[PDB]
């Protein structure tokens, strides 16, 4: 699709479960037990994005 | 004096224990009547 | 239970009725003796569980559907 086909490809998104866990989750790990993480959506906005790929790896993007 | 209850889990968990009750004709039926009664536990050993 | 494999012969309903006139049960069964024989489709002699007259059914009745029905019930020969 138009711009979603530019420079992003299925074989790069295959590693998203690593790049989410070792970056986006790591920057939130134990910070609620440090008193630095009070905003209750900052984890919620980085949930689901890996599950979306882990689903799209077997489910198709249309009818 | 001596009570008829003398506590030990090795003996009580092979006695009224779930694992052989779940592997014997009439023990399987206690579990089915307890699912029908709606008990929170089927076991009595914990 | 003791049953005949070629005829499907099962236990029967029946009473004492002599000394006394009573409907008392006695448990009535076919008497097993077996037969060791040949069917030409199996590359072997076969021993099969049979009772009285059951060997005389094998003598002159077609059995290939029963040999398949035993196998459809998973029963061994």
């Amino acid at each position: 699709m138009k711009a979603k086909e530019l420079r992003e490809k299925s074989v790069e998104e295959l590693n998203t479960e690593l790049l989410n866990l070792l970056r986006e989750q790591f920057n939130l790990r134990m910070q609620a037990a440090s008193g630095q993480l009070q905003q209750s959506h900052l984890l919620k906005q980085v949930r689901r994005d890996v599950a979306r790929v882990k689903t799209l790896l077997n489910e198709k993007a249309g009818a | 004096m001596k009570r008829t209850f003398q506590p030990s889990v090795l003996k009580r968990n092979r006695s009224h224990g779930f694992r052989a009750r779940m592997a014997t004709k009439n023990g399987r039926q206690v579990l089915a009547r307890r699912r029908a009664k709606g008990r929170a536990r089927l076991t009595v050993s914990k | 239970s003791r049953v005949c494999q070629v005829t499907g012969k099962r236990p029967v309903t029946g009473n004492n009725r002599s000394h006394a006139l009573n409907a008392t049960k006695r448990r009535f069964l076919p008497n097993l003796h077996s037969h060791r024989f040949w069917v030409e489709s199996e590359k072997r002699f076969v021993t099969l569980r049979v009772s009285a007259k059951g060997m005389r059914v094998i003598d002159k009745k077609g059995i290939d559907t029963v040999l398949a029905e035993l196998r459809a019930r998973g029963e061994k020969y």
């Binding site: 479960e17 690593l18 866990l21 070792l22 989750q25 790591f26 790990r29 134990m30 037990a33 440090s34 | - | -």
Partner: protein, 93 residues
């Protein structure tokens, strides 16, 4: 090389406790809260793959949450797993 990290989520609290501020004469080892997700087989070699720390010795302990909560019903306070990790000086986490 040094195991796969596709599942790596070590540590759950930097932790605050009185056994680190009323009996801790040497910085040797520091106490942590790690939950039922950690073991001394792992926290000795895996923590270095996520955090910039150095570790030579560790201990682990089950630590039950005593008994009972506010009722409602008896419930639990929950078991929280205690760990002790090498530090030797200053602050590491």
């Amino acid at each position: 090389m040094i195991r796969e990290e596709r599942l790596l989520k070590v540590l759950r609290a930097p932790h605050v406790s009185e056994k680190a501020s009323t009996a801790m004469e040497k910085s040797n080892t520091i106490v942590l809260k790690v939950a039922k997700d950690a073991t001394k087989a792992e926290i000795k070699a895996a923590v270095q793959k996520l955090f910039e720390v150095e570790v030579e010795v560790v201990n682990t302990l089950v630590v039950k949450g005593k008994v009972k909560r506010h009722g409602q019903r008896i419930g639990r306070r929950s078991d929280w797993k205690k760990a002790y990790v090498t530090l030797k000086e200053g602050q590491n986490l």
